[PDB]
Ligand binder design. Structure first.
Ligand code: A1A13
Length: 269
């Protein structure tokens, strides 16, 4: 049940047309069948760390009474670019749960930096990932510096396989308690930034939760998702891209096309 050869040639053609590298790992949680293409290479996380950030906050809420309801107040100076929720509550503040929702569902950069600070920074999120058995994931920096996406730089990277493996543990496995797991799933389900990526490859009658990342350089963008096809076990997948030149543009269509190939590889309709 290594079904990559069904789609290995098509993946090569897609990345050749893209002009960069495409990394995919897709897992059929029923059979354990998998599709791998560059699944062990490091790709820049960009915003995609925010989903894991939200899961780490949910993990801490299992042990720390009232953490989700804590009001957080922040100054104008916290409002880095692409903070579309936290800019509307500057004068009021937001709860930890609302920052978590905004980080997942709007990719809110201020909200992400505020939650990172609650966990003790990039090392604290890295420590949470180590605790669920993820030895690949590393966050090194804050928003926006983590977006540099420098070729060969392992800072602020993971692998498609490690991302998929961790996403499965947190959404479908036992890394979170049942209520926290369902909150994590509900946050990803309600994401607004991913309609042109993995969701574009999935029929309307299937449930999907995703988290996007877009670095804005080096044709670097991504998406991961848990897909619930009707009448079959859920699919977990990660689609990451990078390109050699700083000027190179990311492509949402390439991410959708890659997700389509992964689902075709797993034999899902
Ligand atoms: O930090 C982010 C977050 C998003 C949303 P996503 O990651 O979940 O897809 C984003 C989307 C498209 C692009 Br192009 C860059 C993005 N960036 C990085 C830069 C954002 C920015 C905006 C203005 C000026 C400088 C940087």
């Amino acid at each position: 049940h290594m079904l990559t050869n069904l789609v290995a040639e098509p993946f090569a053609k897609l990345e050749q047309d893209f002009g960069g590298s495409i990394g995919v790992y897709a897992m059929d949680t029923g059979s354990g069948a998998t599709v791998s293409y560059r699944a062990e290479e490091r790709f820049p996380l960009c915003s995609s760390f925010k989903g894991f950030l939200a899961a780490a906050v949910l993990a801490r809420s299992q042990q720390q009474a009232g953490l989700l309801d804590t009001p957080i107040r922040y100054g104008k100076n916290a409002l880095v670019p692409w903070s579309p929720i936290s800019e509307k509550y500057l004068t009021t503040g937001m709860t930890v749960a609302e920052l978590s929702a905004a980080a997942v569902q709007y990719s809110d950069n201020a909200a992400a930096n505020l939650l990172l600070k609650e966990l003790g920074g990039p090392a604290g999120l890295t420590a949470f990932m180590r605790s669920i058995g993820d030895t690949t994931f590393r966050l090194d920096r804050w928003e926006l510096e983590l977006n540099s996406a420098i070729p060969g730089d392992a800072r602020d990277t993971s692998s498609p396989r490690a991302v998929t493996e961790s996403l499965q543990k947190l959404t479908l496995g036992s890394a979170l308690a049942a209520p926290q797991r369902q909150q994590f799933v509900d946050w990803l389900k309600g994401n607004t930034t991913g309609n042109h990526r993995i969701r574009a490859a999935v029929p309307a009658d299937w449930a999907v939760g995703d988290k996007t990342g877009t670095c804005g350089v080096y044709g670097t963008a991504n998406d991961y998702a848990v897909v619930w096809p009707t009448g079959r076990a859920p699919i977990v997948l990660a689609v990451y891209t990078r390109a050699p030149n700083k000027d190179d543009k990311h492509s949402e269509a390439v991410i959708a096309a890659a997700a389509r190939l992964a689902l075709e590889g797993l034999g899902v309709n």
